[PDB]
Amino acid sequence: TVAKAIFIKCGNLGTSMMMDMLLDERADREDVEFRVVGTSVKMDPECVEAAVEMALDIAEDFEPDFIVYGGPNPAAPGPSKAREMLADSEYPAVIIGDAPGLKVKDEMEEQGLGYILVKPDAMLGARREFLDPVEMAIYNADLMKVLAATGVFRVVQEAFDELIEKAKEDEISENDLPKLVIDRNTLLEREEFENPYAMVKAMAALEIAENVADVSVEGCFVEQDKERYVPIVASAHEMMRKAAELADEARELEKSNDAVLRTPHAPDGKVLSKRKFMEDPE
Amino acid sequence: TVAKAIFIKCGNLGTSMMMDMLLDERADREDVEFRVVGTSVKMDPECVEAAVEMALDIAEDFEPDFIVYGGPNPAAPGPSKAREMLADSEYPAVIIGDAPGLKVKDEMEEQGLGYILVKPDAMLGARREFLDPVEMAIYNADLMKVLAATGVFRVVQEAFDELIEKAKEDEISENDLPKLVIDRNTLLEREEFENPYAMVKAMAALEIAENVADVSVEGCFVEQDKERYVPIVASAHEMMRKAAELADEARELEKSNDAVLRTPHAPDGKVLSKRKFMEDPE
Amino acid sequence: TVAKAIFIKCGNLGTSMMMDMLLDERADREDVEFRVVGTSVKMDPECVEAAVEMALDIAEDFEPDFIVYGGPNPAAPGPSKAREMLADSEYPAVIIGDAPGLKVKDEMEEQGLGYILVKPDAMLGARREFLDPVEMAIYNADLMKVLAATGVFRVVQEAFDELIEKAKEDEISENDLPKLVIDRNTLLEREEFENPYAMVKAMAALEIAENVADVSVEGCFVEQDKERYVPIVASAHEMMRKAAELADEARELEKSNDAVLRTPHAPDGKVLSKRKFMEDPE
Amino acid sequence: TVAKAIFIKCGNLGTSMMMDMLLDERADREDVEFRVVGTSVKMDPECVEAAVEMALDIAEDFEPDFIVYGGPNPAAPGPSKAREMLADSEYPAVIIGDAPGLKVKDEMEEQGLGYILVKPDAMLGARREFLDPVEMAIYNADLMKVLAATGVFRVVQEAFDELIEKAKEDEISENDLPKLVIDRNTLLEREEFENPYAMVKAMAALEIAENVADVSVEGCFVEQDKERYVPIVASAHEMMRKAAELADEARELEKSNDAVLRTPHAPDGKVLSKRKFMEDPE
Amino acid sequence: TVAKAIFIKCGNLGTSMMMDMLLDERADREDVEFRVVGTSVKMDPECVEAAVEMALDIAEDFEPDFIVYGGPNPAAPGPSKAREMLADSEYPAVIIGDAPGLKVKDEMEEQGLGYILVKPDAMLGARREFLDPVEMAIYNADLMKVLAATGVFRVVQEAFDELIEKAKEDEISENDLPKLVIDRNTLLEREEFENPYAMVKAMAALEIAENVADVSVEGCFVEQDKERYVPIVASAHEMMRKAAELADEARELEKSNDAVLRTPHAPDGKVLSKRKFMEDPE
Amino acid sequence: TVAKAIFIKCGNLGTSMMMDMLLDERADREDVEFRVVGTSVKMDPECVEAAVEMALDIAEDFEPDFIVYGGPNPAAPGPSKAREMLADSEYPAVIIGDAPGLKVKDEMEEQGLGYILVKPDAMLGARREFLDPVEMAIYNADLMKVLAATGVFRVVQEAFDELIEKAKEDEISENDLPKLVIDRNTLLEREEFENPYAMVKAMAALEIAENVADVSVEGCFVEQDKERYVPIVASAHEMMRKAAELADEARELEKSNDAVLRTPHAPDGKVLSKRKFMEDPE
Numbered sequence A, B, C, D, E, F: 001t002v003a004k005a006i007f008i009k010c011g012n013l014g015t016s017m018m019m020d021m022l023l024d025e026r027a028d029r030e031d032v033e034f035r036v037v038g039t040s041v042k043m044d045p046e047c048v049e050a051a052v053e054m055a056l057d058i059a060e061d062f063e064p065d066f067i068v069y070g071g072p073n074p075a076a077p078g079p080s081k082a083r084e085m086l087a088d089s090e091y092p093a094v095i096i097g098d099a100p101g102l103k104v105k106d107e108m109e110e111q112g113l114g115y116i117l118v119k120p121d122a123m124l125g126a127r128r129e130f131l132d133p134v135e136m137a138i139y140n141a142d143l144m145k146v147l148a149a150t151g152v153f154r155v156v157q158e159a160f161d162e163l164i165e166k167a168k169e170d171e172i173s174e175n176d177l178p179k180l181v182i183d184r185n186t187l188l189e190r191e192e193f194e195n196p197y198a199m200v201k202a203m204a205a206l207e208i209a210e211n212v213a214d215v216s217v218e219g220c221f222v223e224q225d226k227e228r229y230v231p232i233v234a235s236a237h238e239m240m241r242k243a244a245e246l247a248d249e250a251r252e253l254e255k256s257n258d259a260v261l262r263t264p265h266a267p268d269g270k271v272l273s274k275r276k277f278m279e280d281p282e
Ligand SMILES: [Ca+2]
Pocket: B087, B111, B112
C-alpha cells in the first residue's frame, strides 16, 4: 500500500521546512507519495486560504490519506483559517507549529485536528536593521542543527511514520492523529542518547532555543526603540548559535562512544535502527 | 506592480530549499507573490512531470511572470523532463541546480532557460547505513551555514531580485534570464567581505563543500563494498561540518570589525545595504 | 578620609562572593577599610541572625559607614531576618541578592534599605546526586566568568564606589543607597563594549545565565522524580558553561580591537579608565 | 555531634575563597557549623591581626574545634603574625597558602600548625595598568576552574573532612593536622580520573598554573619598565585561561566515558561517591 | 646486523622532512645508521645532481643498503635526474614524492626504483605576496599534524622498517622495494583507529589535504592576476589548517577511549605496539 | 655574489629542522646556495664527528662562507665535539641549540663560535612507552607552529639573512657571528604583532613551550617509576599542544585586523615586508 499526503507550508519554521523530507531521506521509499504546496513565507489569511485551496484542489485527484499544515503560530489569523478549512474537510489533518500554538491546543482537539507543537522552534529576530536573507538563513542553519542533533526531528519522524502505517490500513481516525508538544523535557522520555551528558547538553540546547523565542518577541513586538531592539534581536541569534554548538557537542560525545543512533527507512517504509558505525541498520 | 513566480521543488538542494525565502526574509515585501509546489524528495520523471503539471495548472489562474525549478542534477532524467516542459511553456523559467548541471549548460541555453548552478551545493552521503533523517538534516544545516555565511545565498538573492525588477517592467526576455555558475572563485568578483581573511576562509569553505560532492559520488555510485563506502560517505559529512566551521569563522571576523554586510529588502522590494551593526539599511 | 564597611555573607551568590574584592583589586586603596563576616553557605534564620550579630558587635568598635548583606534570595526567611535587623540598626545598609529578591523590592524600599539584585546570578543545580563540591566550584567558575566578562561586576563596582564617595562626605542618606536591578538589558544603557557584537554576545550570556535559574528551580523544587531532576539540574550547568563561553567570546572580540575597558582604582580610590592595552589608566 | 570551625580570610587565593564552601556544598550538613571572618583583600600585619582577633573574639562563645587561616604567602609579614597568634592560641589551626609558603613549612611544623600549600594557586598579574576588578574576577574564574576540574579541590575537601571527623571524637592532636603540599604530581597518587588522558591534561593544567606564578612574580616584583611588565603580567593571564581550557577538556573526557567522579556529603557529613551520572552516591 | 641508508633531500615535502626520523624516534636503535644529505629547498637539475653525487661519494665508504631520494614531484626535471642516476647506480633506491609523481609511476617501476607517493603531501601556496618563511613553516606544521595524526607517517614507517629488515638478511631485491601510493582510502585497509569516527575524520583531513594541491597549483601555475591568485593560495592554507584540526579531533577521540595506537621501536629495531596509555609496548 | 653555507643536523630541534628552509622559502633566491648533511637523530660523539667530517670534506670543494651546526644541547658530548672541530676549522660557524646550551655560552664565545639558543625549542617526552614515531611527529608539528606563529622563526631568519649579507662582502669576522638567546621576552623587543593581545598570547605560548622542557627532563632523566614518568612526559606533550593553540589564536587576531606580518625574500635575497593581505611586499 502507498500512503499519500499533502504538506502545506505557509511561513517558515525549522520543523515545517524539513517535515516531509524526514520521512524519505534517500527518496527510496516505495510506500509513500507526497505533494508539497504553499505560499512561501507569507501567512496572512488570504495567502493561507490560497495555499489550502491549492491543496484541496490537488486532493480531488491525488486523494491523500492525510494533510499536514505547517508554519508559525497556529493561533494567528492565517493559520486559524487553515485549521478551519482543514477541520471542515474530509481529510485527516495535522498542524505543525511552535509554542504560540499552545494557546489553541484545546481548540485544535475540538476541531478534530492533530498537532505537533515544537517549543524550541523559536521565532527569529525579524527586524529589518538586522534580518537580511543571509542572517535568516544562518539562523535557520543553527536551528536545524539544534532540532536535528538533539533528537527533536526523530520525534517528528516517528509521529508521522506511525500515522503513515495507520494510513496503510485505511481510515485513520481522530484517535490516531498526533497530539504532541515537544520541548527540553521530551528528551527525558526517550532513549536518544547512550551518553547521559550528550542528553543533558541536548536538553540545554533545547532550553536555550526555546528561550530565544521570548527574546525575539521582546525585540520584535514589545521594544520600540531601535537602539534597544536591534541589539535584543541580534542577542537571540547569538543564543541560537550556541544552542547549535551544544547540539554539536552532544553528537560528538555519541561519536566518541560509537553510539550515534541512526533510524533510516527501508524501501518498504520500515524504520530500521542502529548505534554502531559499522552495524547494519535493522 | 507585483511580480509573481512559481517555485517547483523536486529532490533537495541547499539552494532550492531556501531560494524563495531569500527573497522575502520578513514576509513584508508588497511587490512579490509566490507559489511553491513539489513532490518532496522524489525526482524521477513521473514525479517531476506531476510537479511541473501542478505548477502549470496553478499558472493558468496565477499568471506568474516566471517559474523556477530547483533540485539536484539538471542532467538527470526527471530534471531533464522539467527543463523541456518548462522550455516549451509560455513562461520564462530558471533552473537551480548543482555541479552535475554543467553537463547540460549549453542545452539549457539552447532551450532558452536561465540557470543558477551552485557547485558547493554538494550531494550528501546517501547510503542507508549512514544517512537517516537526522543525519540528512545535520548535513543540510552545515551546508546552509556554508551557503549563507560565504555569501553564496546573496549571489542568488541578487540574481532573482534583478529578474523580479525586470518582471515588473514586464518584458522578461531570454536575455534577462540568469546564467550563473557559482563556486569558490565567485567570491573574487564580489565585495562580500571587508576582511580579506574572512574572504579566503569563505573560499576555503566553498572549495571544501565542492569537494564533498566527489566523495559522496565515490561513496554512493562507485564503491560497492560497504566496509569501504560507509566510511567514505561519513567522511564527506565530516568535511562539510568543517566547511561550516570555516564559514562561521569568516562571519565572526566580519563581526570583529563591525563590518557584516546586510542587504535586507524594503517593503517595496528595494534591496538595502549596511555594514555597521547600528547603521540603518539604505 | 577612610570609608569603612562591613560585608555579611550568608549563603553564596557569584556577586556576594566577589563584592568586597571588586572594590580593592590590588589591595592598594588607602581610602577604604573592610571587615567581612559570615556563616559560610548556611542562611537559615538562626545562622543569619548570628551573622548579623557578629557584624553589629564588630560595628560598635569598627564604626562602619555602611553594611552590606549578600547572598541568595532576599525574600527567604534567613535574609528577611537580616533585612529586619539591618533596617532597625543605625547603619545604612545594602542588600545584594538575585532575581527572587524582586518579590521584596518594595518592602526593601519601605525598610530604607539599598539593593542590588542581579538576575543572572542564578541558583545552581543543588541536588545531592549531581552537585558535589567540585561541581559547585565549576559552576561558580563559569558564573564568575559571565558576571565579570559581561560587565556586570563593573556595574556593582560602580554602585559601591559611588556609595563610598558619599560615605567620605559623611551624609549617607537613604537617597544615596543603590537601588539596582541588573539583567541582560542593563548592557543597553552602558558603554562597556566598543564592539556591538561583543555587547550582544554578552547580552546573550546574561540571558542564558538568567534562564539557568528557572531550570535549577524546576529541578530542585518542582520535579520530584530523580530520573528527571538529575538531568534537569545538569542541563542548567551545561547552559552556564556556554554562557561563560559567550562571555569569553565577547572579551576576545574586544581584545581583537585593542579596546578592553579597564577601570582600576588609584591608591586614593579614584576610579581610572583605559581602553588601549598600553594606555595608562587615567 | 557538630564540628565547629572558624575560617579567617585575608587577601585572596582560589583555595581560600572556596575552602569553607567545599565542605557543605548544598548547606544540608547537620554535623558542621562555620563562622568566617576576614579583612577582605588586605593582609598587612595590622589587618591580619584584626582578623585573627575577630576570630578569637568569636571563639570564646563559639567554641570551635579548629581555626583555619587562608590567604597568600604564609611567609609574608601579615600571615606570619597570624601563624604566631594561632600557634600561641589554644585552638588547633591549619594554614592554607600557596608556593611561597614552602619557605616557612618547617617553621609551621615547629609552631604546631597544619598546612595545605597549593602550588598551582598562582599569584595574578597585579599591575594597575592591567588588573582592574573585572580582570581580577576573570583570572579568579579561570583559576577556580583549574583547581576544581583538576581535582585539587577534592584533595582539599578530603583533608578537611578527615579533620572534621577527628574533631567529632574531640581528639584533634598536632598529628591529626594536615601537612599537604599540592602540585601537578599530586594527581599521580590519586584515583581522580578514569581516563589517563584526562589525568595528563589535568596535570598539564596544574603545571601551567604553577608556572603562572613565576611570570606574575617577574612582572610584579622584578621587571620595572611598564613596556615590559604590562605584557608580562597579561601573558600570565592568557596562560591561566589556557590552563582552564585544559582542565575543562579533561572534565569533558570524563563525561564522554560517563566516569565523572562526584563525592558529595550526606546530611550526616559522610562523604559519598559515584562515577555514573544516573547512579546514586554511596 | 646494522642496516645503513642514505637519505637525499632536495626541495621539501612533509614526508621527506620527517622520513628518516620516523625510523629512530628516540635515537636508541642499535640496528640502523643513516646519513642525510641535500641541497635544502633547491631541486633544479644542477642542485639535484650535486646532491646525488654527495650521496654516492659518501656511499663509497659508507656502503649503504639502500638510498632514499625525497622531495616534490618525481616527474620534474631535477627529480628525474635523481631517478636516472639512482637507477643506474649499484644501490637499491626508493623515491619519496607527492601526487604529481603518479605521472612517472610506471617509469619508476621500469627503472627498478621503489616509491612512496603521498597524495595528501600537498604543494603549498608559493607566491611571494603570501608565502614568507613564517607562513611556509605554519603550513608545514599543519601538514605534519595531518600526516602524523591520520596515520600516514605510520604507513611510511612500516614500509621502511620492512625494507630495513630485508637489508639485514643480506639481499634487497627489486621485489622488496616499496611501491606505495597513499591517500584518504589508504586508511580503509588499516586498523589505525579504534573509533570509526576518528577514522572518518582522519579520512576527511586527508581528502582536504589532497584537495589543497589543486588550489595551490591553480594559484601558482594557472591564475596570473595577483588580485585573484593571492586569495587563492591563501585559501589553500586555510584548508590545510582545518585538515589539521580534523586530524587533531580524530586523535582526541582515540584519547577518549584510551585507544591511541603507539608503535615504538625497541633498541634492536623491533616495532612494538600498544593501545592503552599505561600498557607496556610489546 | 652567491653566499654559500653548509648546515649540519644531528639530533632534532624545531629550529634545526627548519633553519635552512626559512632562508629560501620559495627556492627562488639567486644569491644563496646550501648544502645540508647529517646523521639523522643520532648525536653521540662518533656520529657527530662523522657529520662534521662530511661537512668539512664537502667544504673543500664547496667553499662555504659559514657553517651551521644545529641540534639539541650544545653542552652534550656529541655537540661539544662539533664545536671543537668547527672552532678549529677555517670556517666561521654558528651553533643552533636549546636552553641547555646556556651552560656553554661563554665557552662558545671563547671558541669564536656564533650561537642561536632557542629556549622554547623544548625537549620532548622521550620514553618508549609514550613516544613512538607518530607522537614524535605530532609534537614537532605543535612546536613548529609555536616557533613559527610566535615570530621566533623570523628572529632566526633575520639573524642568518644578516650573516649572509656580510658573507657577500667577504668579511665574516667573529664580531659578525650571531649571539642570540631567544625566549618569551624576545618578543618585547620586536614589532612582530600589531595587536598587543596577539603578542601576549604569543608570549604565553613561548613560556609554556619553555616550561615543557623541565617536565620532559623530569620525566626522562629524574623520575624512574614508569607509573609516574609516562604521565609526566605525556603531560609535557599536552602543554605543547596548548602552546600551539595560543600561537594559532595570536595569528588569527592578526588576521582579524589584516595585519599579518610577512617578510618574504626577493630573488636577489632582499627581505621584503608587508602587513596588509593585498599589499605587495616591499
Ligand atoms: Ca523558444
